[PDB]
């Protein structure tokens, strides 16, 4: 029963799809977003009309996310 | 270069995790918590980092 912690300890782990690139492709649906994939992989999900893998909501857009 | 900055606390309040992504155009700057970022959007203040107008706040999760 893995509940995510308060702070995003896994933010530095690689994209869960390609397993090499940083998590910078935020999958946005409504006012929430799941950030577990890189921009390239997340764009491919939307291009191929696939839903967000985590919550299964339709993907409205991918936001290229920076962490300044 | 992986986002180690993402694990630091909200730049504005220093006590909450960075889950308020500030969207502008097709990009987002994630450095503030949702509460602080929403206060900025409600007051039509710009992104703290790049000072561009805020399109929306995305409540962000790291699953
Ligand atoms: Cl300001
Ligand atoms: Zn990827
Ligand atoms: Zn989702
Ligand atoms: Zn804050
Ligand atoms: Zn910005």
Numbering used by the authors:
A (entry chain B): 424 to 491
B (entry chain A): 429 to 491
Extract from the study:
A prior solution structure of MDM2 RING domain homodimer determined by nuclear magnetic resonance showed that this region is flexible and adopts various conformations, suggesting that the 310-helical turn configuration observed in our structures might be a product of UbcH5B–Ub binding. Since flexible or disordered regions usually lack electron density in crystal structures, we also crystallized and determined the structure of cat MDM2-422–C-S429E to 1.21 Å. The asymmetric unit contains two dimers. The electron density for residues 429–C was visible and MDM2 adopts the same configuration as seen in the cat MDM2-422–C-S429E-UbcH5B–Ub structure (r.m.s. deviation of 0.30 Å for all Cα atoms). Despite contributing to crystallographic contacts, the region preceding the RING domain is able to adopt the same 310-helical turn configuration independent of E2–Ub binding. In all the structures of MDM2 homodimer bound to UbcH5B–Ub presented here, the N-terminal region preceding the MDM2 RING domain adopts the same 310-helical turn configuration.
The most prominent regulator of p53 is the Ub ligase (E3) MDM2, which binds to the transactivation domain of p53 through its N-terminal p53-binding domain, thereby inhibiting p53’s transcriptional activity. Furthermore, MDM2 catalyzes ubiquitination of p53, where monoubiquitination promotes nuclear export of p53 and polyubiquitination leads to proteasomal degradation. ATM phosphorylates MDM2 on six residues (S386, S395, S407, T419, S425, and S429) that are close to the C-terminal RING domain and far from the domains associated with p53 binding. Here, we show that S429 phosphorylation selectively enhances MDM2 homodimer E3 activity, but has no effect on MDM2-MDMX heterodimer E3 activity.
